[PDB]
Amino acid sequence: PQITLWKRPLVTIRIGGQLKEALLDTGADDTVIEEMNLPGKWKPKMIGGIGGFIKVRQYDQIPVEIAGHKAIGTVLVGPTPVNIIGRNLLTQIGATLNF
Amino acid sequence: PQITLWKRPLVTIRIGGQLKEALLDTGADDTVIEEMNLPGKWKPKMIGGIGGFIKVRQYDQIPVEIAGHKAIGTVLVGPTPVNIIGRNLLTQIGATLNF
Numbered sequence: 001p002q003i004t005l006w007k008r009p010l011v012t013i014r015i016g017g018q019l020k021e022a023l024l025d026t027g028a029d030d031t032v033i034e035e036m037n038l039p040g041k042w043k044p045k046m047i048g049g050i051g052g053f054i055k056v057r058q059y060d061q062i063p064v065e066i067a068g069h070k071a072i073g074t075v076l077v078g079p080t081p082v083n084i085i086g087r088n089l090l091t092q093i094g095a096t097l098n099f
Numbered sequence: 100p101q102i103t104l105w106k107r108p109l110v111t112i113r114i115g116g117q118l119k120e121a122l123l124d125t126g127a128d129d130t131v132i133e134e135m136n137l138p139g140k141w142k143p144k145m146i147g148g149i150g151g152f153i154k155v156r157q158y159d160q161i162p163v164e165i166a167g168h169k170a171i172g173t174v175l176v177g178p179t180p181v182n183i184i185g186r187n188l189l190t191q192i193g194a195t196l197n198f
């Protein structure tokens with residue numbers, strides 16, 4: 001899909017067998033998902049953004065379906081205002097910026 | 100051009116007669132430039148991201164050239180670790196996400 005940026009690039013994703021809305025964020029190194037139960041072990045981690053640093057749970061090798069496209073990587077779960085798909089998963093689905 | 104997301108999508112922009120490196124951010128509603136003495140009237144405002152909110156100065160109709168592409172719009176100036184080109188300006192240069 002070719003997505004324009006007139007509106008926030010929000011798409012539906014499936015993670016942990018559940019559907020969620022997520023922002024395709026090219027300015028994000030990592031993928032940060034709102035607090036939820038994800039099967040598997042997790043390690044505590046700190047990531048920074050605008051405003052500062054927050055504490056997140058780091059889940060590795062998690063399968064995530066982005067608009068029907070598969071990706072398996074690291075997902076950080078924490079207190080985020082919106083579900084964010086970062087470059088770590090965007091590169092897996094072959095996402096590019098064009099202009 | 101086509102920009103892959105293997106590394107952060109950093110490009111050269113021209114603002115206030117200066118050349119800066121900025122991040123193409125589809126997850127940003129606004130454009131945020133690192134602290135600089137831009138002339139003109141401004142309006143105080145608060146923008147939020149991952150770790151919280153930061154106070155910034157809102158400058159309207161600021162000319163900003165992005166990778167040789169001309170644009171003009173609202174620019175926020177404040178304590179940011181990196182220059183962020185948001186959707187407000189990305190749409191003007193015809194930028195899209197493709198996968």
Ligand SMILES: CCC(=O)N[C@H](C(=O)N[C@@H](Cc1ccc(O)cc1)[C@H](O)CN[C@H]1Cc2ccc(cc2)OCCCNC(=O)[C@H]([C@@H](C)CC)NC1=O)C(C)C
Binds near residue numbers: 025047049147181
């Ligand atoms: C440092 C590693 C890194 O890349 N961190 C990421 C990050 O915050 N990236 C921001 C840019 C940045 C890069 C390197 C660095 O060292 C510090 C900051 C990027 O700007 C985040 N993109 C969005 C995400 C978001 C979207 C909506 C939100 C909150 C967050 O609430 C809606 C409210 C509206 N907020 C926004 O539109 C902001 C603008 C203002 C940021 C400039 N957007 C972002 O922060 C997080 C998301 C893993």
